[PDB]
A paper describes a structure:
Here we determined the high-resolution structures of the human 26S proteasome holoenzyme bound to the chemotherapeutic Oprozomib and its apo form using single particle cryo-electron microscopy (cryo-EM) and additionally determined the dynamic properties of the proteasome. We then proceeded to reconstruct the three-dimensional (3D) structure of both the non-inhibited and Oprozomib-inhibited 26S proteasome at 4.8 Å/3.8 Å resolution, respectively. While additional density is absent in the β5 active sites of the non-inhibited structure, a clear density for Oprozomib is visible in the β5 active sites of the inhibited structure. The Oprozomib–26S proteasome structure exhibits well-defined densities for the entire proteasome holoenzyme (with the exception of Rpn1), showing numerous amino-acid side chains in most parts of the molecule and relatively small variations in local resolution. Specifically, regions encompassing both β subunit rings and the α subunit ring of the CP bound to the RP, as well as the ATPase of the RP are resolved at a resolution range of 3.5–4.5 Å. Owing to the visible side-chain densities, we built an accurate atomic model of the holoenzyme with the unequivocal assignment of amino acid registry for regions with B factors smaller than 110 Å2. In contrast, drug binding considerably decreases the available conformational space and creates an energy barrier for the molecules making it less likely to reach a fully rotated state. This is manifested along several eigenvectors (data not shown) and indicates that although a subset (14%) of 26S proteasomes is observed in a rotated state upon Oprozomib inhibition, the maximal amplitude of rotation attained is only 20°. Irrespective of the precise pathway of the propagation of conformational dynamics, the ATPase subunits (Rpt2, 3 and 6) adjacent to Rpn5 and 6 and directly above the α-subunits 1, 2, 3 and 4, exhibit an asymmetric B-factor elevation. In conclusion, we have provided evidence that 20S proteasome inhibitors allosterically regulate the RP to adopt a non-rotated (presumably inactive) conformation.
Numbering used by the authors:
A (entry chain B): 2 to 168, 172 to 200, 206 to 243
B (entry chain J): 1 to 196
C (entry chain H): 1 to 221
D (entry chain D): 9 to 241
E (entry chain F): 6 to 203, 208 to 241
F (entry chain C): 2 to 235
G (entry chain E): 4 to 237
H (entry chain G): 8 to 186, 191 to 244
The structure:
């Protein structure tokens, strides 16, 4: 009945979308995982849920998801929805291969996912996908690149943007846009996460290469105990 | 029963069609040009059934043209060739078999020139030189005898004139003019048509 | 394919030869034709080699979903009726002349499923071409209410009589014995067909090859 | 709120009597059936002067001998103008003749009160078409114009005014028309537009006029014909 | 506001869109049906508004399957709708199973139809009580009555309508079991003239041994014979 | 399958969902275009993309096929669907009639599409507004401006962004005949018109030009500076 | 009034609360009167002129091949209902090759306009037909209603203040079943000439009548042909 | 918002439709108590005719699912026959689809599961009737089950259903901890000790199944009359 | 028929109002413990009925998914039974296409995938059953929990249902990484023994283990056996 519908696909009298900016406040409750690119490859830097021992082993974490040989994605907000959509977008990646025998240049993928997620906020009367997930990737066309999207639908090349709480302004006083030298990108990542820390309560993951094929590393345990002692002051 | 030919150079690939639009007993206007302009550097050719050549390959021209003028850059000829192999291969068995066999000349910038080939069953294979039609059956050994893997441009053109003068001499169909286009690292450039 | 199965006082004894011959050449000399459905129900298979596989994966999966939905052990009547109704509505395009047998809470009994969907409760069945080579040895020496050991010997003599004078012969006999308490799925029961032997070694070492281009690729590190 | 298929405590539908409004909003159009033609005019209400005024289509020719004149919520008519011309060439296709004006007006007005929330496939309409229009056309019966409503009600008309000037221009048109064309109904109708004037003295940039005469097919007037008429007033 | 939707219960378990449909047949005229050993006799009250309506302006004794009947009470649109789909239901039974439809199965079928139509907010309940009635050669004079709730009971002398509070008493005091239907056709007028307390241009139909499993408006003679039960 | 009628007539003929889309285009960027009689030209004051943007994927300026190109203004993710369907049917209109597709027809397709979303069952008509510029078979550098009610107008300035009522009254004041030359006075009029609103073009403005059915060229911020300097010099 | 979301609901007394209000919506419509003789039934309608002048929104309609109607309520909904009634009357001409009898006609439209009264979010057909035709027996005449409850009546009047026409026509039923065409339609026009606002004339413009019965097609008398029916002074 | 309107979660859980549907099964109240015998699952219920004008044979609860499963339900009798017809449908569908006749447990699982999908989806009310249903399979003893309108079948010895459920299950709990094929001091005496009528053999319906004869049998006033005069100990 | 509009929606705070109500309906459910152990798990739960009247061999709460994967719940009654129905069906799709028993992780992927669209998609309310998963899958056992949101996490021990904070803190106190067989059963029994509302009857608890030979329920003669060995 028309008394019962939440009426998600309605413009406000101020013109905005009520169910969309409620998803934007869902990101600020739970969300971390910045991403830094360099002249070399790109990394995510992430946070787990809490200190609660009672957690045996994650193959990959609940944060960094593999998508192709040359792409990966990280997730903010509601974790139940995005899992679905990331499997959804994973399907998209593979069928581009089936249509083209190319490793899907990542802007095609981000455009496709943002079109279907825009389609859930356009009609159907359903709630929008409450996740502002972001993407890292490489293609032969462009360089190493990361994109960042939100439950509204728009996206962009967001060279050092983080998602979730405590919002990135320090990064737009510290990132050198020309050259970055990915070891120092790790150093800047543990700087920002050191302000906002071993791999019990951090989840950092890099994307690099050797001889053409890309390598997605999840930065196993003892590397984090290296970088956490790479400070004195910061 | 038409004729398509192509030769892959070291930094180019040249194709040539027969410039004859046939009928039951007679031939129509010669030109009708079979080589369909793709984005900037891809160029495919189509013979076979009279009515699926102008239909299928133009639809492929629509989708690849939409890809370039939708997302900036164009396709490499590998993805265009596997694209049209997918589209013909899944339009094959369903309801209306598109009975066309394609050549697809092309080159990417940061890899070599490629000349893809497929039958009417959409089985794709690279080739340094490929042919089509009934005229394929006699002219292909001249591209076996003389084709080095590295060949200059004018040597390949006069080799192509050897192939067309043999095709003029033995093959029973009146194919008097042939449309020739060399594509290479400055874009689709077409040489003057060969006549007799 | 020569197949068979005999009911007896405790249970049933299935049995099949193991050879699958596409065209007029054996593609594979040792394949199981006695397919699992259930810890109390084994079927068999003849006709199309793939259609029996897929129809008993489907009825195996759907049946043990059914049995763990009920909680008890699944009966063999419902396997007969799911194979009958699911095999009927494809109008016999599936060629699967399979028999199936089971010990259950009512009694040990077996059915035969013709590829159009006609079912027969019988004391003894034979599908495949080797039916004809293995039905007569159920007509001179079959007795009702017979003990397990000469029933095993009976079915081995039946399938062994489908070996020696049929061109859908098999390498070796495997047969399952489904009783009230124990199941005995034994692979090959007898091997009446040895390979023979070769005479004289053949090859040199790092010769007898026209190598045009090698290529080596390591894997681990 | 309440839905679209509900009746109002006045007596009529909600969405229909709300679709009678947003006809007061929008430009004004007038039409006069005569004995030797039918003239249509509309002051299409240009907003800015920085611009091009000859692409505000408010006189649209359905066929060669049917021209409509819409107002109100503009560009909501394009689906039913599309249905008008597709139905027109379907009639000429299947029957090899011209049409009436009550057959195109019969065919369009069936689509007016045809909407609803829960119905067949979502290519249907939700709101009613909030555009009132009138088909000036010539037939083998006679020249005539059929004033539609958004309710699907269409009536025979010989002098009808729509838009915001549906009271004063209609009452002025009620007392100035009885006889015939003789070239001056088109000059005594822009005179009604001259009384209506909102922003500008009705030059050949802000009014579009077109006549349908039985000899020709139609005539969408160009600029020098219009300002030839405006010079005579 | 626990009202206005049939998919929402009360806080004491009482779906108000059903009991609002039940009073929606209590503001409509009576239609009594009396069972006896040779068949079931119907009789419907009529509340003729103007002289403009002619005789049988609205049928309220429909028939369905050439033997069961349709004395209806409430909204004649809804009652006429389920009358014609009862016609289609006995059509699907006779076409499907050959054997002529036993009435218990038809009353259970139309009963679960109008009940399963009260489980959704996307439909309203029906607003029409109605009753059936016939007999096969070995059935007995079966009649059933169906509420807008969808419950169907076998009765002897059920009466639905506005004045069913009066009408149930005389049918209870009438001798029910053993009389041969012709007298009770006559006696039906006594019930209808008692319960009408204000043109009462009534109408009767039955099924009986004078009919052999059929329906007739009376034939037409008791309309000038049971009219002679005025002054009682 | 959601079938609630959203875009419904309220009283006094007011179709509130469409005017809510009118604030939704009132709360966007500030797009502007000039029909400059041999050239056409756009411009949209962009935000802080220099801090950490990617300029390649901040494009309010897209391209439909080669000659027609549009600058949307509002919600920036419902627009990209209309971009995609414009490109798709534009290729279909290259399939049938095989022309350099006229700008009138594609803007009638956009206005007809948005009007088809003011009609269907429950899908929230768009909050975008276009500047369909381009050419045709014979010059004629026609500009078009659509609307969320699906009404397109063939006007010549149509500054329809967020602070663009001042820009369109400025362009009403200062566009008569001084911009009939090749490019310089027209582009000077555009960058003057957007420098009315914000600050310098080294961080804010970006433009695009189109000349006689070739060379849709954007202007990198090194070149925009020269024009900005000329305007400043005045 | 929570009974405004309302062809699903019941008022707590008995009322369905808007399909009797559709009966109000045909009380609001224009007045008409039909009647029947022993031989041929007639229909008479006055046509409202809410304009300059018109054909006054022609009421009585040709459906048939002797089963004619007289609408009074919504006009587009009336035309939809007579395209239904028209199309299946011609379908009974097609299949059975007999005249479709009037009773089954009015009963199955009485089951066709009954469906939106039943289901959700669909208004009833707010039109009061006054159909009249000559089948095998005498020429029937049926009022039907938007409450889907037709009436096998004789001499019925529906429309604006038509109750006075009924109370003339109720006390003059005795001279029906006689009274041939020339003196019958006079007896119907002087029944119609009470719904008018007490000022003098059934003009030839506004009165359109229809005749149907023995050995004559359902025949429409328009502006000219009603002029031979002339008499009465009151 | 709509916690007590739609089958959705309120705060602190407790979706407010199933306990509004539980209160629906107490409407009027014609009350079943089911007795289980290590060899005989008897059925008891009370049934009141209003006015000696109903046909007492036609009014019942006591339906027959198949040749081995009987049932009795105490909910609102409108929702009863829509539920028992689907149970007959799934019984015959089980016998056509899986061979053997359906055993009593997963029948009640299945109608409990469609009652679940009533109380999972919106736009349908969870219909208020609970199905006391008995039956014997080959393996175990006689069983009895009751799915509620929420779908929670349990597997009972001796519950009851209808008005006065708590007094009945208290009496049965106090009269089962002592240890009954005759069921003469258990079956009727639960009713006569809860609501104190000490029935004549009209108003009580009894449906037995026995291991020696698994066909579901509804008893008549002769054998239930001997069953009642056996309460003279 | 149907609604085709989601009743689960976003609050003005920015959170799902229905899902926290679903976790409330879980938290008002019967308490259930689950202990991942070095070779195998134990998933205990508490079956307190109304009276001593019912058949405690009739309904189960430990019940397998067709090969070696049992799953135990806490919360709504029959919504669990729907999730067992869907879970068995998904495990049999996987078994008929890939011809192995399903990895536990993939079964939790697909069960969390089917529980997501009931937080969307047309009038359906979310399930409100946070059932937990077991499974031997090759080499080392697994354990999971699909919340009525659709999230899932793997660990070494958990509890759920009533007073589960005491279960999580108490299992955080008494857990060892090598603690493997029947000692896990021991601490599971003395996690349900913590409240139980009284007397620790063997007919009111049931456990299920995954001792490298398929998930299997424990017979009621075995739980009372260790209830004799308390």
């Amino acid at each position: 009945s028309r008394r019962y519908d939440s009426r998600t696909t309605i413009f406000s009298p101020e013109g905005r979308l009520y169910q969309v900016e409620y998803a934007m406040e869902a990101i600020g409750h739970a969300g971390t995982c910045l991403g830094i690119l360099a002249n070399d490859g790109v990394l995510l830097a992430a946070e787990r849920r809490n200190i609660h021992k009672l957690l045996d082993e994650v193959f990959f974490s609940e944060k960094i998801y593999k998508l192709n040989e040359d792409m990966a994605c990280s997730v903010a907000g509601i974790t139940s929805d995005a899992n679905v959509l990331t499997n959804e977008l994973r399907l998209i990646a593979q069928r581009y291969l089936l249509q083209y025998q190319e490793p899907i240049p990542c802007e095609q993928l981000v455009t496709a996912l943002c079109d279907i997620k825009q389609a859930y906020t356009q009609f159907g009367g359903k709630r929008p996908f409450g996740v502002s997930l972001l993407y890292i990737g490489w293609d032969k066309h462009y360089g190493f690149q990361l994109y960042q999207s939100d439950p509204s639908g728009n996206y962009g090349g967001w060279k050092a943007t983080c998602i979730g709480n405590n919002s990135v302004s320090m990064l737009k006083q510290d990132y050198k846009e020309g050259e970055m030298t990915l070891k120092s990108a790790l150093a800047l990542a543990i700087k920002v996460l050191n302000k906002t820390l071993s791999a019990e309560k951090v989840e950092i993951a890099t994307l690099t290469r050797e001889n053409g094929k890309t390598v997605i590393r999840v930065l196993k345990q003892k590397e984090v105990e290296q970088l956490i002692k790479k400070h004195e002051e910061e | 029963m038409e004729y398509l030919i192509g030769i892959q150079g070291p930094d180019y690939v040249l194709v040539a069609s027969d410039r004859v639009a046939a009928s039951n007993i007679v031939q129509m206007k010669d030109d009708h040009d079979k080589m369909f302009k793709m984005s900037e550097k891809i160029l495919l050719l189509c013979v076979g059934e009279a009515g699926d050549t102008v239909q299928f390959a133009e639809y492929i021209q629509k989708n690849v043209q939409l890809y370039k003028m939708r997302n900036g850059y164009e396709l490499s000829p590998t993805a265009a060739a596997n694209f049209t192999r997918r589209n013909l291969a899944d339009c094959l068995r369903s309801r209306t078999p598109y009975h066309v066999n394609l050549l697809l000349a092309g080159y990417d910038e940061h890899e070599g020139p490629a000349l893809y080939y497929m039958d009417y069953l959409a089985a794709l294979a690279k080739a340094p030189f490929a042919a089509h039609g009934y005229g394929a059956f006699l002219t292909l050994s001249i591209l076996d005898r003389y084709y080095t893997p590295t060949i200059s441009r004018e040597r390949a053109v006069e080799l192509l004139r050897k192939c067309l003068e043999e095709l003029q001499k033995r093959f029973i169909l009146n194919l008097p003019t042939f449309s020739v286009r060399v594509i290479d690292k400055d874009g689709i450039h077409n040489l003057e048509n060969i006549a007799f | 394919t020569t197949i068979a199965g005999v009911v007896y006082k405790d249970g049933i004894v299935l049995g099949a030869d193991t050879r699958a011959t596409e065209g007029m050449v054996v593609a594979d000399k040792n394949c199981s034709k006695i397919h699992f459905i259930s810890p109390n129900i084994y079927c068999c298979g003849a006709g199309t080699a793939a259609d029996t596989d897929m129809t008993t994966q489907l009825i195996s999966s759907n049946l043990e979903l059914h049995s763990l939905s009920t909680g008890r052990l699944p009966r063999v009547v419902t396997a007969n009726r799911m194979l009958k109704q699911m095999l009927f509505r494809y109008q016999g395009y599936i060629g699967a002349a399979l028999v199936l047998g089971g010990v259950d809470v009512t009694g040990p009994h077996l059915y035969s499923i013709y590829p159009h969907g006609s079912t027969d409760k019988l004391p003894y069945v034979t599908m495949g071409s080797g039916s004809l080579a293995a039905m007569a040895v159920f007509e001179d020496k079959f007795r009702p209410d017979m003990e397990e050991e000469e029933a095993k010997n009976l079915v081995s003599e039946a399938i062994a009589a489908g070996i020696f004078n049929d061109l859908g012969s098999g390498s070796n006999i495997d047969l399952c014995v489904i009783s009230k308490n124990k199941l005995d799925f034994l692979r090959p029961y007898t091997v009446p067909n040895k390979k023979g032997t070769r005479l004289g070694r053949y090859r040199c070492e790092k010769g007898t090859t026209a190598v045009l281009t090698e290529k080596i690729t390591p894997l681990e590190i | 709120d309440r839905g679209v298929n509900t009746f109002s405590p006045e007596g009529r539908l909600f969405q229909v009597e709300y679709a009678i409004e947003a006809i007061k909003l929008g430009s004004t159009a007038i039409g006069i059936q005569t004995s030797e033609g039918v003239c249509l005019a509309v002051e299409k209400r240009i907003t800015s002067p920085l611009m091009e005024p000859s692409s505000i289509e408010k006189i649209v020719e359905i066929d060669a001998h049917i021209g409509c004149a819409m107002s109100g919520l503009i560009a909501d008519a394009k689906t039913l103008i599309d249905k008008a011309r597709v139905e027109t060439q379907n009639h000429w296709f299947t029957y090899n003749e011209t049409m009436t004006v009550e057959s195109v007006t019969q065919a369009v007005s069936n689509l007016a009160l045809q909407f609803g929330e829960e119905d067949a496939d979502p290519g249907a309409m939700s709101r009613p078409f909030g555009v009132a229009l009138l088909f000036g056309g010539v037939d083998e019966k006679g020249p005539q114009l059929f004033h539609m409503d958004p309710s699907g009600t269409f009536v025979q008309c010989d002098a009808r005014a729509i838009g915001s000037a549906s009271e004063g221009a209609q009452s002025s048109l009620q007392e100035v028309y009885h006889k015939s064309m003789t070239l001056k109904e088109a000059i005594k109708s822009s005179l009604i537009i001259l009384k209506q004037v909102m922003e500008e003295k009705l030059n050949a940039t802000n009014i579009e006029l077109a006549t349908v005469q039985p000899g020709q097919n139609f005539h969408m007037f160009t600029k020098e014909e219009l300002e030839e008429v405006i010079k005579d007033i | 506001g626990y009202d206005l939707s049939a998919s929402t219960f009360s806080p004491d378990g009482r779906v108000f869109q059903v009991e609002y449909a039940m009073k929606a047949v209590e503001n409509s005229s009576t239609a009594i049906g009396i069972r006896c050993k040779d068949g079931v006799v119907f009789g419907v009250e009529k509340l003729v508004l103007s002289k403009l309506y002619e005789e049988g302006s609205n049928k309220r004794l429909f028939n369905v399957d050439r033997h069961v009947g349709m004395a209806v009470a409430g909204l004649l649109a809804d009652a006429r709708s389920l009358a014609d789909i009862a016609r289609e239901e006995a059509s699907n039974f006779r076409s499907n199973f050959g054997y002529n439809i036993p009435l218990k199965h038809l009353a259970d079928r139309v009963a679960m139809y109008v009940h399963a139509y009260t489980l959704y907010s996307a439909v309203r309940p029906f607003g029409c009580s109605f009753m059936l009635g016939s007999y096969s050669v070995n059935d007995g004079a079966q009649l059933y009555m169906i509420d807008p709730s969808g419950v169907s009971y076998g009765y002897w002398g059920c009466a639905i309508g506005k004045a069913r509070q009066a009408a149930k008493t005389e049918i209870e005091k009438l001798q029910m079991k053993e009389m041969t239907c012709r007298d009770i056709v006559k006696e039906v007028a006594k019930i209808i003239y008692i319960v009408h307390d204000e043109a009462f241009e009534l109408e009767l139909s039955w099924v009986g041994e004078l009919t052999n499993g059929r329906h007739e408006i009376v034939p037409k003679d008791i309309r000038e014979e049971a009219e002679k039960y005025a002054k009682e | 399958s959601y079938d609630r009628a959203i875009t419904v007539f309220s009283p006094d003929g007011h179709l509130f969902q469409v005017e809510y889309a009118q604030e939704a285009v009132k709360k966007g960027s500030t797009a502007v275009g000039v029909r400059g009689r041999d050239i056409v030209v756009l411009g949209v004051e962009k935000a802080s993309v220099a801090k950490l943007q990617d300029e390649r994927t901040v494009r309010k300026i897209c391209a439909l096929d080669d000659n027609v190109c549009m600058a949307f203004a509002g919600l920036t993710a419902d627009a990209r669907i209309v971009i995609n369907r414009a490109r798709v049917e534009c290729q279909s209109h290259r399939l049938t009639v095989e022309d350099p597709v006229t700008v009138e027809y594609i803007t009638r397709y956009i206005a007809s599409l948005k009007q088809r979303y003011t009609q269907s069952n429950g899908r929230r008509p768009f909050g975008i507004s276009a500047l369909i510029v381009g050419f045709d078979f014979d010059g004629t550098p026609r500009l078009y401006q659509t609307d969320p009610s699906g009404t397109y107008h063939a006007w010549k300035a149509n500054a329809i962004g967020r602070g663009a009522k001042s820009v369109r009254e400025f362009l009403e004041k200062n566009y008569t005949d001084d911009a009939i030359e090749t490019d310089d006075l027209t582009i000077k009029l555009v960058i003057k018109a957007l420098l009315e609103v914000v600050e310098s073009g080294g961080k804010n403005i970006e433009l695009a030009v189109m000349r006689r059915d070739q060379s849709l060229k954007i202007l990198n911020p090194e070149e925009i500076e020269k024009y900005v300097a000329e305007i400043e010099k005045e | 009034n929570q009974y405004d979301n309302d062809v699903t609901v019941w008022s707590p007394q008995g009322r369905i609360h808007q399909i009797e209000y559709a009966m109000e919506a045909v009380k609001q419509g224009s007045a008409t009167v039909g009647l029947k003789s022993k031989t041929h039934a007639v229909l008479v309608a006055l046509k409202r002129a809410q304009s300059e002048l018109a054909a006054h929104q022609k009421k009585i309609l040709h459906v048939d091949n002797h089963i004619g109607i007289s609408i009074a309520g919504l006009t587009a909904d009336a035309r939809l209902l007579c395209n239904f009634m028209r199309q299946e009357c011609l379908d009974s001409r097609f299949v059975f090759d007999r005249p479709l009898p009037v009773s089954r006609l009015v009963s199955l439209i009485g089951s066709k306009t009954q469906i939106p009264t039943q289901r959700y979010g669909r208004r009833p057909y707010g039109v009061g037909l006054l159909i009249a035709g000559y089948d095998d027996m005498g020429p029937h005449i049926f009022q039907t209603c938007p409450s889907a409850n037709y009436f096998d009546c004789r001499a019925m009047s529906i429309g604006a203040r038509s109750q006075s026409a009924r109370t003339y026509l109720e006390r003059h039923m005795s001279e029906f079943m006689e009274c041939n065409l020339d003196e019958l339609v006079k007896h119907g026009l002087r029944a119609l000439r009470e719904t008018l606002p007490a000022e003098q004339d059934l003009t030839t413009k506004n009165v359109s009548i229809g005749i149907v019965g023995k050995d004559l097609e359902f025949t429409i008398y328009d502006d000219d042909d009603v002029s031979p029916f002339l008499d009465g002074l009151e | 918002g709509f916690d007590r309107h739609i089958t959705i979660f309120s705060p602190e859980g407790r979706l407010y439709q199933v306990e509004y549907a539980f209160k629906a099964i107490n409407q009027g109240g014609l009350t079943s108590v089911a007795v289980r015998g290590k060899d005989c699952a008897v059925i008891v219920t009370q049934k009141k005719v209003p006015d000696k004008l109903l046909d007492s044979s036609t009014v019942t609860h006591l339906f027959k699912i198949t040749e081995n499963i009987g049932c009795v339900m105490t909910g609102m009798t409108a929702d009863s026959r829509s539920q028992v017809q689907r149970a007959r449908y799934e019984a015959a569908n089980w016998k056509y689809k899986y061979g053997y006749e359906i055993p009593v447990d997963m029948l009640c699982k299945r109608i409990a599961d469609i009652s679940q999908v009533y109380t999972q989806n919106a736009e349908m009310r969870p219909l208020g009737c609970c199905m006391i249903l008995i039956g014997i399979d080959e393996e175990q003893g006689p069983q009895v089950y009751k799915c509620d309108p929420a779908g929670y079948y349990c597997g009972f010895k001796a519950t009851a259903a209808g008005v006065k459920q708590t007094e009945s299950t208290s009496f049965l709990e106090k009269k089962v901890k002592k240890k009954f094929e005759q069921t003469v001091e258990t079956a009727i005496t639960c009713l006569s000790t809860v609501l104190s009528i000490d029935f004549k053999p009209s108003e009580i319906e009894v449906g037995v199944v026995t291991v020696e004869n698994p066909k579901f049998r509804i008893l008549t006033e002769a054998e239930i009359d001997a069953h009642l005069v056996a309460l003279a100990e | 028929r149907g609604y085709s509009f989601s009743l689960t929606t976003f609050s003005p705070s920015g959170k799902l109002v229905q899902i926290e109500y679903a976790l409330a309906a879980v938290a008002g459910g019967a308490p259930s413990v689950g202990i991942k152990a070095a070779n195998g798990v134990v998933l205990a739960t508490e079956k307190k009925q109304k009276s001593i009247l019912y058949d405690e061999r009739s309904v189960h709460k430990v019940e397998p998914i067709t090969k070696h994967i049992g799953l135990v719940y806490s919360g709504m009654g029959p919504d669990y039974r729907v999730l067992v129905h869907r879970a068995r069906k998904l495990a049999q799709q996987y078994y008929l296409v890939y011809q192995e028993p399903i990895p536990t992780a993939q079964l939790v992927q697909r069960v969390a995938s089917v529980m997501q669209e009931y937080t969307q998609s047309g009038g359906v309310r979310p399930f409100g059953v946070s059932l937990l998963i077991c499974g031997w899958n090759e080499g080392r056992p697994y354990l999971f929990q699909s919340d009525p949101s659709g999230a899932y996490f793997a660990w070494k021990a958990t509890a759920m249902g009533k007073n589960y904070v005491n279960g999580k803190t108490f299992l955080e106190k008494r857990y060892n990484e090598d603690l493997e067989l029947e000692d896990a059963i021991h601490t599971a029994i003395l996690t349900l023994k913590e409240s139980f509302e009284g007397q620790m009857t063997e007919d009111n608890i049931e456990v299920g283990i995954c001792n490298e030979a398929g998930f299997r329920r424990l017979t009621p003669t075995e739980v009372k056996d260790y209830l004799a060995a308390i």
